[PDB]
Coordinates of C-alpha atoms and ligand atoms in Angstrom, one line a residue:
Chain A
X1 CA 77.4 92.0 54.9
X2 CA 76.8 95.5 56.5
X3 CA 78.0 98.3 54.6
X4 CA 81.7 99.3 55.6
X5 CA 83.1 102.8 54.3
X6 CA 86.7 102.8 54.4
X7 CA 88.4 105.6 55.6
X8 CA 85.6 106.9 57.9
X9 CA 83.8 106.1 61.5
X10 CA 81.7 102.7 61.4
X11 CA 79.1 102.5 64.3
X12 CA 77.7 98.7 64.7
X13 CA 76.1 97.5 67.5
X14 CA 75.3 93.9 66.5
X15 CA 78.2 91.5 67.4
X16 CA 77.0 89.6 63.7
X17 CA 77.9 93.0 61.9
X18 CA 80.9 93.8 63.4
X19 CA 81.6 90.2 63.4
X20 CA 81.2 90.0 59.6
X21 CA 82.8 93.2 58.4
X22 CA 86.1 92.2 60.8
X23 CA 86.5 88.7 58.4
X24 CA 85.9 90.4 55.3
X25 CA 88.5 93.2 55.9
X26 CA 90.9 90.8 57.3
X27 CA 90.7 88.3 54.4
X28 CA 92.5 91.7 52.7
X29 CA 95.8 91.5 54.5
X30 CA 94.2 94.7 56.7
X31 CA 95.2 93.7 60.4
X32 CA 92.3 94.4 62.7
X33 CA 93.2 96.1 66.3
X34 CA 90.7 96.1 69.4
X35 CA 90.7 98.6 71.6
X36 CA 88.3 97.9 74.7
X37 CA 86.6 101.2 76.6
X38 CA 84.0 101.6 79.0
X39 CA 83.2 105.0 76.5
X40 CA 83.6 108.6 78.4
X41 CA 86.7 108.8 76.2
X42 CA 89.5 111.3 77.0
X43 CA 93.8 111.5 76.2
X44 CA 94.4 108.2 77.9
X45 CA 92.4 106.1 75.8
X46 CA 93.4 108.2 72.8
X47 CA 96.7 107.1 73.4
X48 CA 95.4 103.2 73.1
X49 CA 94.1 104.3 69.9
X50 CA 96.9 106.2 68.6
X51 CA 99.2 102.7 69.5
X52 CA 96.4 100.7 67.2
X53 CA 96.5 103.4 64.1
X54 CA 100.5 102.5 64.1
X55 CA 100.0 99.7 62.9
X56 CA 100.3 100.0 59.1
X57 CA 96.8 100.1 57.1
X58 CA 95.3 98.2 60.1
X59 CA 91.3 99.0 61.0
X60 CA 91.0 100.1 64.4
X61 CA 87.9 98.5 66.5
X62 CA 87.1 100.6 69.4
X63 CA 84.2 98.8 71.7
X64 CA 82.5 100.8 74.1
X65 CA 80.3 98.7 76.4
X66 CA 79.6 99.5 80.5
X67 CA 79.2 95.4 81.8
X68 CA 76.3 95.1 84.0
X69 CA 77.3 94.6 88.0
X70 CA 76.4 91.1 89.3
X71 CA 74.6 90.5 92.0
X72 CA 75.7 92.1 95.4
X73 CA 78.4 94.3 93.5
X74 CA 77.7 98.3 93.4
X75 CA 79.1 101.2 91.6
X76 CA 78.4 112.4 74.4
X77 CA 81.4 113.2 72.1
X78 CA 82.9 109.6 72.0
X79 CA 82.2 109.2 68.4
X80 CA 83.4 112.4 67.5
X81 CA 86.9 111.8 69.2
X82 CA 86.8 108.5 67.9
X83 CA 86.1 109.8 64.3
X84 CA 89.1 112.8 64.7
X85 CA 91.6 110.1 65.6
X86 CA 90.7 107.8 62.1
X87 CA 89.1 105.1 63.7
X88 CA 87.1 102.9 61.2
X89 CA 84.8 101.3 63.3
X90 CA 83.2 102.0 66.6
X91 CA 81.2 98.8 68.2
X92 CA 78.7 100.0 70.8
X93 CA 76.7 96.7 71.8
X94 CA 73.8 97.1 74.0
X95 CA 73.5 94.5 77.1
X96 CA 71.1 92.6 75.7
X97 CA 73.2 92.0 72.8
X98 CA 75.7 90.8 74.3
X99 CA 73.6 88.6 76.5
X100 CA 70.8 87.6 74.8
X101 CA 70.4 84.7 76.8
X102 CA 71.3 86.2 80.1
X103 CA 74.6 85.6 82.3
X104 CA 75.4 81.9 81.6
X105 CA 78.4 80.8 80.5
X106 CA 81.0 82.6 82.2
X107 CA 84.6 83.3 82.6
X108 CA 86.1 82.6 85.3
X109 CA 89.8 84.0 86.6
X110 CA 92.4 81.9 88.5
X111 CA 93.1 84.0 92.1
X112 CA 95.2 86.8 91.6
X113 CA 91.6 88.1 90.6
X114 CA 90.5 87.9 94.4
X115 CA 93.8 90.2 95.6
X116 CA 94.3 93.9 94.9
X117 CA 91.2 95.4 93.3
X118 CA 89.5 92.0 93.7
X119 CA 89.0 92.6 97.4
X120 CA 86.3 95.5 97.5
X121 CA 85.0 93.4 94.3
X122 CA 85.1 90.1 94.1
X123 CA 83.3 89.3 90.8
X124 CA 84.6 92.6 89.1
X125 CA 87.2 90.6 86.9
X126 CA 85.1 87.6 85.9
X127 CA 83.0 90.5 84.5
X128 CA 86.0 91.6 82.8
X129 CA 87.2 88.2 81.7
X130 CA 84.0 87.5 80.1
X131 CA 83.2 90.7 78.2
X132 CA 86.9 90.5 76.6
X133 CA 86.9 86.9 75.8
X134 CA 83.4 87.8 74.1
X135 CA 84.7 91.1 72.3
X136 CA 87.9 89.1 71.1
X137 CA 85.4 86.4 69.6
X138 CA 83.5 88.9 68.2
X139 CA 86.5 91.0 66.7
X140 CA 89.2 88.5 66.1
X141 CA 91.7 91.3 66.4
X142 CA 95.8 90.6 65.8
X143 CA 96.2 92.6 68.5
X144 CA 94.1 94.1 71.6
X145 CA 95.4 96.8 73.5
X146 CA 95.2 98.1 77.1
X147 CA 96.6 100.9 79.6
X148 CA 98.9 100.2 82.3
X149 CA 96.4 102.5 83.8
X150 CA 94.7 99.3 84.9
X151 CA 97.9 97.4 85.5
X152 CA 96.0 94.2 87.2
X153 CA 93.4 93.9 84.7
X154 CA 96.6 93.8 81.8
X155 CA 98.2 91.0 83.9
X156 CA 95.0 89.1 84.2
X157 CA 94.0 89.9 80.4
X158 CA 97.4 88.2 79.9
X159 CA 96.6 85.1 81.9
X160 CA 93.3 85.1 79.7
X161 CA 94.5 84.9 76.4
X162 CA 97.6 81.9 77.7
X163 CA 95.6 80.0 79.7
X164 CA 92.5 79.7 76.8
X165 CA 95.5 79.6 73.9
X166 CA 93.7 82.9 72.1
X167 CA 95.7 83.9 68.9
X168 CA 95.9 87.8 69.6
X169 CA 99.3 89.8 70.8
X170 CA 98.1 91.4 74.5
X171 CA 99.7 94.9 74.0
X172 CA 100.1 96.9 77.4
X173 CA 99.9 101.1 76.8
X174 CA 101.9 103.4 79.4
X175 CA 100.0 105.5 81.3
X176 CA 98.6 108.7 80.4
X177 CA 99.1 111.5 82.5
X178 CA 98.6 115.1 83.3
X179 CA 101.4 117.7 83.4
X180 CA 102.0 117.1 87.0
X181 CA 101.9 113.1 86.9
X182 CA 97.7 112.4 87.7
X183 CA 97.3 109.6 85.6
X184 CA 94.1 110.5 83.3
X185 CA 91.1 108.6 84.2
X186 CA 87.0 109.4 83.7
X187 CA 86.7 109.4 87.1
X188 CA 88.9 112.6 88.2
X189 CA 86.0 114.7 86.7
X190 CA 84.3 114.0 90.1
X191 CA 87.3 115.9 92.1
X192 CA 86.5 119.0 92.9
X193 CA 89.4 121.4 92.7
X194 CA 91.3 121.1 96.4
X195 CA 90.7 117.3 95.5
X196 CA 92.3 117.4 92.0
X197 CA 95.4 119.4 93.8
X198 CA 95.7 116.7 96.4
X199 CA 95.4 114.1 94.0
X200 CA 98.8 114.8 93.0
X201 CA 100.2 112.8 95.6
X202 CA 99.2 108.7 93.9
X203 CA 101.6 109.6 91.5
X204 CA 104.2 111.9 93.6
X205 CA 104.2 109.0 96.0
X206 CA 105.0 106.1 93.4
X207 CA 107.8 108.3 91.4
X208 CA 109.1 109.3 94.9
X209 CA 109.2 105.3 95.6
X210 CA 110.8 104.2 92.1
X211 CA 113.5 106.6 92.9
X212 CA 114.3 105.8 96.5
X213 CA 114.0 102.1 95.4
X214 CA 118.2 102.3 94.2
X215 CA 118.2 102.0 98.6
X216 CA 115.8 98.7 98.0
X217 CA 112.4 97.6 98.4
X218 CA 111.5 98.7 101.8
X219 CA 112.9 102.5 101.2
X220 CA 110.6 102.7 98.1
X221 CA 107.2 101.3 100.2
X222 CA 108.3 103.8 103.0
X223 CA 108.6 106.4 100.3
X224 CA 105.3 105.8 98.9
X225 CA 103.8 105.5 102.7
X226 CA 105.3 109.0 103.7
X227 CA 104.3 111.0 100.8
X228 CA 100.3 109.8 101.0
X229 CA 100.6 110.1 105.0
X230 CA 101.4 113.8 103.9
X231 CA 98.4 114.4 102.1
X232 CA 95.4 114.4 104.6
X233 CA 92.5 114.2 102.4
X234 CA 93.8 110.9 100.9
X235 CA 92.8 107.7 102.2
X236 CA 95.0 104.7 101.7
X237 CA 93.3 101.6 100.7
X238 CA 96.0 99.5 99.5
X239 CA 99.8 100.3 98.5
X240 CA 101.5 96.6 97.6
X241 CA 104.8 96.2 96.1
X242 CA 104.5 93.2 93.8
X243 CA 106.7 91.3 90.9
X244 CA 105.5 92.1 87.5
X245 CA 102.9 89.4 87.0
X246 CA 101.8 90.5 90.7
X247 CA 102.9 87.6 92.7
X248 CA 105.4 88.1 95.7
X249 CA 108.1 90.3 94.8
X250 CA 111.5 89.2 94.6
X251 CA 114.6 90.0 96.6
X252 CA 116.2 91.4 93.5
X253 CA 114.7 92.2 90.4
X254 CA 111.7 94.3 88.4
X255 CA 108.7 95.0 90.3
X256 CA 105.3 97.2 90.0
X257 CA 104.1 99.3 93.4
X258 CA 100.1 99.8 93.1
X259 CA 98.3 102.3 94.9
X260 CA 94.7 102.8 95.6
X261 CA 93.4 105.3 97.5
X262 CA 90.1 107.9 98.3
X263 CA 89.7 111.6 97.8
X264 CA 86.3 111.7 99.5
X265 CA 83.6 109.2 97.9
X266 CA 86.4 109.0 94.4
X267 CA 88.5 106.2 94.5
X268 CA 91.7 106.9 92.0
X269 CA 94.1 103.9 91.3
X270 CA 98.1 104.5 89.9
X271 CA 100.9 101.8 89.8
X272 CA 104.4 102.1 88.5
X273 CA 107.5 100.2 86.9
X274 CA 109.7 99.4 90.1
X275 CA 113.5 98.3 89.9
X276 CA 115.1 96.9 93.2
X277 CA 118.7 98.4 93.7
Chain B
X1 CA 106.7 75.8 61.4
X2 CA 106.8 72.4 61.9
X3 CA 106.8 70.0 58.8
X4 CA 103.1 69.3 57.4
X5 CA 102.7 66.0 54.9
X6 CA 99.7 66.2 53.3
X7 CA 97.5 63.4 52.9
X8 CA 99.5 61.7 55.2
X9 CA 99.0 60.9 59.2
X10 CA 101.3 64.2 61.3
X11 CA 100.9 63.9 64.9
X12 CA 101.5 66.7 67.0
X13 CA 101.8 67.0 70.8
X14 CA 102.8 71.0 71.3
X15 CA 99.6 73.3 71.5
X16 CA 101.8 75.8 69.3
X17 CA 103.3 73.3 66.6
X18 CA 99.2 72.3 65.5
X19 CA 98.0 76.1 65.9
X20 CA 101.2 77.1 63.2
X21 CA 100.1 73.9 61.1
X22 CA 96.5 75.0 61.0
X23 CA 97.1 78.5 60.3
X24 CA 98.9 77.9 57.0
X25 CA 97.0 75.1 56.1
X26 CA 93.7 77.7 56.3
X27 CA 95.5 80.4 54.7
X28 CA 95.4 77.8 51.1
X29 CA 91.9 77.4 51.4
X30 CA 92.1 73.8 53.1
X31 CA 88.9 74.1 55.8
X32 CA 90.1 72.8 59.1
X33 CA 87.8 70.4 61.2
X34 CA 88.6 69.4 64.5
X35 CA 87.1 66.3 66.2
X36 CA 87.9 66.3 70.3
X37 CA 87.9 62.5 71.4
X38 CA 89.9 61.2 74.7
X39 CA 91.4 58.3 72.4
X40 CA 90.3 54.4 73.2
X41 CA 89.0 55.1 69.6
X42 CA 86.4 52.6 67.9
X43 CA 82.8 53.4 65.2
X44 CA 81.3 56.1 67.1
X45 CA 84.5 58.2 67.0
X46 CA 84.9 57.3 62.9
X47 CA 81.6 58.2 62.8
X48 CA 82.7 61.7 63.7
X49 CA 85.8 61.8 61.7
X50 CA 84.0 60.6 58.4
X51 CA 81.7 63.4 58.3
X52 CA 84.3 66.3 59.1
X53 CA 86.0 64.6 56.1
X54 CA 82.7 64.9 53.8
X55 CA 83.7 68.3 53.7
X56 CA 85.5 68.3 50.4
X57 CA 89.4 69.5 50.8
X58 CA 88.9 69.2 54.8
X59 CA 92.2 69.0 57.0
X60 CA 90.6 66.9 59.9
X61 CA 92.3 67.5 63.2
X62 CA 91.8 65.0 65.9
X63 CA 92.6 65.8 69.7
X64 CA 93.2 63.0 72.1
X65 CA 93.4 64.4 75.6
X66 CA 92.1 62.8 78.5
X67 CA 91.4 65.9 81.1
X68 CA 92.6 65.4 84.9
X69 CA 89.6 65.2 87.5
X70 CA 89.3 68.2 89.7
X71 CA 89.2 67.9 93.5
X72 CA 86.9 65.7 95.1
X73 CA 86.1 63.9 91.2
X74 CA 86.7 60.2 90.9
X75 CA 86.9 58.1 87.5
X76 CA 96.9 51.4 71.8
X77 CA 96.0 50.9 67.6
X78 CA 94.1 54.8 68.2
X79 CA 96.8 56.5 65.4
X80 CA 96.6 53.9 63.0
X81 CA 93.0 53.7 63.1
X82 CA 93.0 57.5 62.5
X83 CA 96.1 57.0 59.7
X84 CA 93.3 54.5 57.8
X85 CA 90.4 57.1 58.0
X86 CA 92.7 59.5 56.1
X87 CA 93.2 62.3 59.0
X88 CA 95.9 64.6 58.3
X89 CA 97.0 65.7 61.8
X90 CA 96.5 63.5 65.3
X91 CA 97.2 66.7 68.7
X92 CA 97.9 64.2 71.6
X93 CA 99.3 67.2 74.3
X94 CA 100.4 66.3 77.9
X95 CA 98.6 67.6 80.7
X96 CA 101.5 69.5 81.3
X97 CA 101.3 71.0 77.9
X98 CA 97.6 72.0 77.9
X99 CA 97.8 73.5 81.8
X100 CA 101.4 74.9 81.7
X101 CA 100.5 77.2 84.3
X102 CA 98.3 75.0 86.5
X103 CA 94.5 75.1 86.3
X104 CA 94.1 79.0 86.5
X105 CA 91.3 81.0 84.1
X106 CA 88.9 78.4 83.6
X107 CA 85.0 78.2 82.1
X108 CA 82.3 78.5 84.5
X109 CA 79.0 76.6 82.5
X110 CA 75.5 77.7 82.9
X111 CA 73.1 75.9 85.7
X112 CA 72.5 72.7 82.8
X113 CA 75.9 71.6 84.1
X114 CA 74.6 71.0 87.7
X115 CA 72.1 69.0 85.9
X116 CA 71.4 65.4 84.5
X117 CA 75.7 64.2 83.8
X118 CA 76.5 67.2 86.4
X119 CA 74.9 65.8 89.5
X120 CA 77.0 63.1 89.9
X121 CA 80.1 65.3 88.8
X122 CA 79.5 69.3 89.6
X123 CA 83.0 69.8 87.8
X124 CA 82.9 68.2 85.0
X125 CA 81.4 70.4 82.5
X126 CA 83.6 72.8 83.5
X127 CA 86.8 70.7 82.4
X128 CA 84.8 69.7 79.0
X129 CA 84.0 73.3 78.5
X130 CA 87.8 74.7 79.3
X131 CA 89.1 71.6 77.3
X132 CA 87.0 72.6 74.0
X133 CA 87.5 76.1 74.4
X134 CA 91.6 75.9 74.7
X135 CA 91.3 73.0 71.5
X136 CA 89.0 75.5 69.5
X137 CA 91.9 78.4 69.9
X138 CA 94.5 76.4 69.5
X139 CA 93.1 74.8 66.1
X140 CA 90.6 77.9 64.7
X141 CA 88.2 75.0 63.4
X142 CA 85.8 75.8 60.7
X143 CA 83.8 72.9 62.2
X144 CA 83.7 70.8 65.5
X145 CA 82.1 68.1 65.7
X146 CA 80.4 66.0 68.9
X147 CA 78.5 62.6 69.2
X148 CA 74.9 63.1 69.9
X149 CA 75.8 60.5 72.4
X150 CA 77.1 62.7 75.0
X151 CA 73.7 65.0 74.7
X152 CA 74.0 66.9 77.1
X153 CA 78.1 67.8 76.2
X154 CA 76.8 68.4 72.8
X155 CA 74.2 71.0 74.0
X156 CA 76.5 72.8 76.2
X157 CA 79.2 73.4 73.8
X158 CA 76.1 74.6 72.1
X159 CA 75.8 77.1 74.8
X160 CA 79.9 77.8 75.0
X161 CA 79.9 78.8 71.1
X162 CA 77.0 80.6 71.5
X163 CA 77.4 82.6 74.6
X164 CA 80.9 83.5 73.8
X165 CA 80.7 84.6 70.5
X166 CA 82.6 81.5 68.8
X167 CA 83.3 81.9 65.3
X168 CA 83.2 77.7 64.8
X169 CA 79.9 75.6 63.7
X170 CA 79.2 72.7 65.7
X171 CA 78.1 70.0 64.0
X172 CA 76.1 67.1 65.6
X173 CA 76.6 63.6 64.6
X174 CA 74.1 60.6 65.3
X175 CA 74.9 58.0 68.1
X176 CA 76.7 55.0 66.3
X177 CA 75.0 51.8 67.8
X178 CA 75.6 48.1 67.4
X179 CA 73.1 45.6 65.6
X180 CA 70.8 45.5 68.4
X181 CA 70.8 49.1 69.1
X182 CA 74.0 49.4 72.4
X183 CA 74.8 53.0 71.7
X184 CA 79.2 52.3 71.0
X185 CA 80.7 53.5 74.1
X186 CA 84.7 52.2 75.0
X187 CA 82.5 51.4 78.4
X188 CA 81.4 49.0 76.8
X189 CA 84.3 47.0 77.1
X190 CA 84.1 46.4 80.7
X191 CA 81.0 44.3 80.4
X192 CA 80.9 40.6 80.6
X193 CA 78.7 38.6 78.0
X194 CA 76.0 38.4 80.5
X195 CA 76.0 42.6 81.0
X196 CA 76.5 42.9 77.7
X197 CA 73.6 41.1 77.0
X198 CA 70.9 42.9 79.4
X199 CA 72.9 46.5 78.2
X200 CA 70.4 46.2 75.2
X201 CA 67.6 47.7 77.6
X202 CA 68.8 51.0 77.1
X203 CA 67.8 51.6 73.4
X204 CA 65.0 48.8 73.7
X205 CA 63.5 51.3 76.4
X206 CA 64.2 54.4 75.0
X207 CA 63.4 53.4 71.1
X208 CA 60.2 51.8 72.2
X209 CA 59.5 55.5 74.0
X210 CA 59.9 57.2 71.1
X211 CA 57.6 54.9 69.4
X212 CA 55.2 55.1 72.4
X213 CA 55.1 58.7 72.6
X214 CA 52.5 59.0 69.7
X215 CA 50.0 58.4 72.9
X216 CA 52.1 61.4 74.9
X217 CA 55.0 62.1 77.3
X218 CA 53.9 59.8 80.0
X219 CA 52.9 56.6 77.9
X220 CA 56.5 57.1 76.4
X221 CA 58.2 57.7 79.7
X222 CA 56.4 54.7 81.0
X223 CA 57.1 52.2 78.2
X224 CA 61.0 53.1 79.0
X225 CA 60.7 52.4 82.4
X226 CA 58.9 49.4 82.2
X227 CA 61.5 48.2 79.7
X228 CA 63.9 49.0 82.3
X229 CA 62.3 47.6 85.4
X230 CA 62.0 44.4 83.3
X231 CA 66.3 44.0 83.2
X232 CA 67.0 42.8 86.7
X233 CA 70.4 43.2 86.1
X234 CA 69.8 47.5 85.2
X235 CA 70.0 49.9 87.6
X236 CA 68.4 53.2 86.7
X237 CA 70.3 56.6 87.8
X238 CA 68.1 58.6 85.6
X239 CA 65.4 58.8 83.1
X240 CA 63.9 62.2 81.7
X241 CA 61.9 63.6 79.2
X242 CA 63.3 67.3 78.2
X243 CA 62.9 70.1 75.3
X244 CA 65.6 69.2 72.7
X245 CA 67.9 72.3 74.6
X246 CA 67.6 70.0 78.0
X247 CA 65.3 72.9 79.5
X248 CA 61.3 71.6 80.3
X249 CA 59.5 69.4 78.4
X250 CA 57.1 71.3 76.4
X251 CA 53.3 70.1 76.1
X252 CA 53.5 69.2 72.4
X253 CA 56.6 69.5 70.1
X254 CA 60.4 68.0 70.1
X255 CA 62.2 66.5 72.9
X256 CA 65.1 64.3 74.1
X257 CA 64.8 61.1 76.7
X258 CA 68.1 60.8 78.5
X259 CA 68.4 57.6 80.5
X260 CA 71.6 56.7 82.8
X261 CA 72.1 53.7 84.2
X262 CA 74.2 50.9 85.8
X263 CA 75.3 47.4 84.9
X264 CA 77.0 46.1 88.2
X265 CA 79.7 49.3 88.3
X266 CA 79.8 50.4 84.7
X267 CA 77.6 53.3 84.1
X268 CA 76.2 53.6 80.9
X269 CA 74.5 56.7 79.1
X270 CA 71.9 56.6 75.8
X271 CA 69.3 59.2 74.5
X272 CA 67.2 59.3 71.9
X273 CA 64.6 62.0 70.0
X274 CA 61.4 62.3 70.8
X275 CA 58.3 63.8 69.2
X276 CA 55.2 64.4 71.0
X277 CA 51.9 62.8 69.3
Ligands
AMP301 N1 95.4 107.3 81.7 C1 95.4 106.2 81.0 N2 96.6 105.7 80.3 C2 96.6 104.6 79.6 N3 95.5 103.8 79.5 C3 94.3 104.2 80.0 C4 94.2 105.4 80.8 N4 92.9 105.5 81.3 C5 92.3 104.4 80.8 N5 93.1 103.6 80.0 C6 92.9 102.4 79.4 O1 91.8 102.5 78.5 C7 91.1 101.2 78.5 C8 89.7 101.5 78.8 O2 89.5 102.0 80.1 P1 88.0 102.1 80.7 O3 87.2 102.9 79.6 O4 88.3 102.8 82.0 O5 87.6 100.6 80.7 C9 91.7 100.3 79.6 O6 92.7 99.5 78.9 C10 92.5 101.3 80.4 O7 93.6 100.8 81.2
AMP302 N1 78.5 55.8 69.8 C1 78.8 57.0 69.4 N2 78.2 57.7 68.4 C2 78.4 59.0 68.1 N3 79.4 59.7 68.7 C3 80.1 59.1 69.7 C4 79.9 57.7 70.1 N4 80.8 57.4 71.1 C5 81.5 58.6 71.4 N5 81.1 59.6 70.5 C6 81.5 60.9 70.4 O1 82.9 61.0 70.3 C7 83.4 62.2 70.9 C8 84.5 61.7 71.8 O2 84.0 60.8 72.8 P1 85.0 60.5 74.1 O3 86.3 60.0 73.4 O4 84.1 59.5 74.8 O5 85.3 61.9 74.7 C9 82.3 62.8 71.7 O6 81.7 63.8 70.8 C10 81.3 61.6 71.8 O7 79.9 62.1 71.9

């Protein structure tokens, strides 16, 4: 078994390591929690983190792993945050390692997977699928946790771990934000300032909506609509109003509005909690 | 949790009511090993169950499921048999039970599926592959264990385990035949005397092959089809020579012969190891 200092950052990067020191710490009564990043941390995954570490005396697994594109599909203080925040064990795979015998088995997602942010990529969440089904092997976590942030990838996540029967809680984070709602992401350091200012709207827009939505459904899309038609250097892709698993929404009852939309060549994604009157 | 009666025959059909069961029973120490069968049990299946239960204080876990055929796919004494082999705990789940939300995230295999089995049924790896996967959550097996019968099943679970990080060893257990060598199949029972009879030339062909292949791949791929050719009554489907992981035959080293073949409209399957001079 690797070594494993408690109490202090653990970098592995062989599935068999982390693999190995997750059982043993387990067998302890420690309860292991996975959290899943694409690295280039910042507040919003800190907040996943900080939702582990409340777990009492668990060990906090923090992967960081960028999943190759398929074919046709296009597209450092890590540590050091991860250390500050008491995480015990960073897993940082490299591709190979994770694929040592190339793309083969694979998972693959029933079709709410094609809809939403499946449209512009249609193999984007068997990628997903299959690197968490991998890392939860790897890990065997009690618990994995992800952001709201990436509302559709939670549902699917969910529909993962009930349609294989996987033993781990799913454990959905709010969304981080900055002081004037932008919900944090990696990708808002490629705004330039007039587009960080205008970015404001994804989130003015949804809030406006979740508000006007006492008046019902089609009140809270217009909302959405008229606040993002006010901003003219955002470019709508998608705005939906769906139920909370992200089928049709209902007459009456709990929703989720998702937005995504272009500042220039950056596309930014929000969603929000919607109730219907 | 459910009630558990040690060394005593519990059956459970409820995906939740074994994985509580199998849980605590791992938590004393008691290794769990699972055996996946689609009931009709008979020798070849005991086979299996008797060497999960070699493993001293073993709770063996039989499944009987039979999985629906996709789209476009064509195609009882079982518990006490199991109650006299000593197995603790029989899962029989509904369809219903195991696909509660319909057939939705699934396993995609590798190419091998599309091979050999797969071209006659494109789908059906993919429903073995989903199948094992769901049983080996639901039960967190120390062991599973698969008839070398079904070769090709037995080297893509191989490739499941492997290529998604499965914490489970499989165990492979030699093809249980009848005095003059019929591999046991519950096919076997929808030959008449006469079928029955010229069924033998599957093992004649494929053990006199393996003794054949001392002079090389094509005197022992030529010994088995002459044995074929000489059953009028035998049909051949397929017969290959392969690497022992079902890629290319290598010049010299291990291999496997996989034959197919058809006695009026029962299709029966054998293999044997091979060795090259
Ligand atoms: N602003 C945010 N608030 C909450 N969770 C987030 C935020 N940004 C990213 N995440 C979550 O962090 C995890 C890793 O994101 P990524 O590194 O973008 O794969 C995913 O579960 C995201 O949904
Ligand atoms: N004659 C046999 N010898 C060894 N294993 C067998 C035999 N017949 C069936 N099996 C194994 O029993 C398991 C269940 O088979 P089935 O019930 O046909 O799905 C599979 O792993 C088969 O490969």
């Amino acid at each position: 078994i690797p070594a494993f200092h408690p109490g202090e950052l653990n970098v592995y990067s062989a599935p068999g390591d982390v693999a190995d020191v997750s059982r043993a710490l387990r067998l302890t009564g420690r309860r292991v929690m996975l959290v899943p990043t694409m690295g280039a941390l910042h507040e919003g995954h800190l907040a996943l983190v900080r939702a582990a570490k409340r777990v009492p005396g668990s060990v906090v697994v923090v992967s960081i792993f960028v999943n190759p594109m398929q074919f046709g599909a296009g597209g450092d203080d890590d540590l050091a945050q991860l250390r500050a925040e008491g995480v015990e064990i960073a897993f940082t795979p490299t591709t190979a390692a994770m694929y040592p015998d190339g793309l083969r088995t694979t998972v693959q997602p029933g079709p709410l997977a094609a809809e939403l942010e499946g449209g512009p990529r249609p193999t984007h969440f068997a990628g997903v699928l299959t690197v968490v089904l991998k890392l939860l092997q790897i890990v065997r976590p009690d618990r994995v946790f992800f952001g709201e942030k990436d509302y559709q990838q939670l549902v699917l996540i969910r529909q993962l771990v009930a349609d294989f029967n996987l033993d781990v809680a799913v454990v959905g984070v709010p969304t981080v934000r900055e002081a004037d709602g932008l919900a944090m992401s990696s990708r808002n350091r490629y705004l330039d300032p007039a587009q960080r200012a205008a970015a404001v709207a994804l989130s003015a827009a949804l809030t406006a909506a979740a508000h006007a939505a006492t008046a019902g459904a089609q009140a809270a899309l217009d909302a959405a609509r008229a606040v993002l038609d006010a901003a003219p250097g955002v470019a709508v892709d998608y705005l939906e109003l769906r139920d909370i698993g992200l089928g049709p929404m209902p007459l009456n009852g709990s929703g989720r509005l998702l937005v995504a939309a272009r500042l220039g060549t950056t596309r930014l994604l929000d969603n929000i909690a919607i109730e219907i009157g």
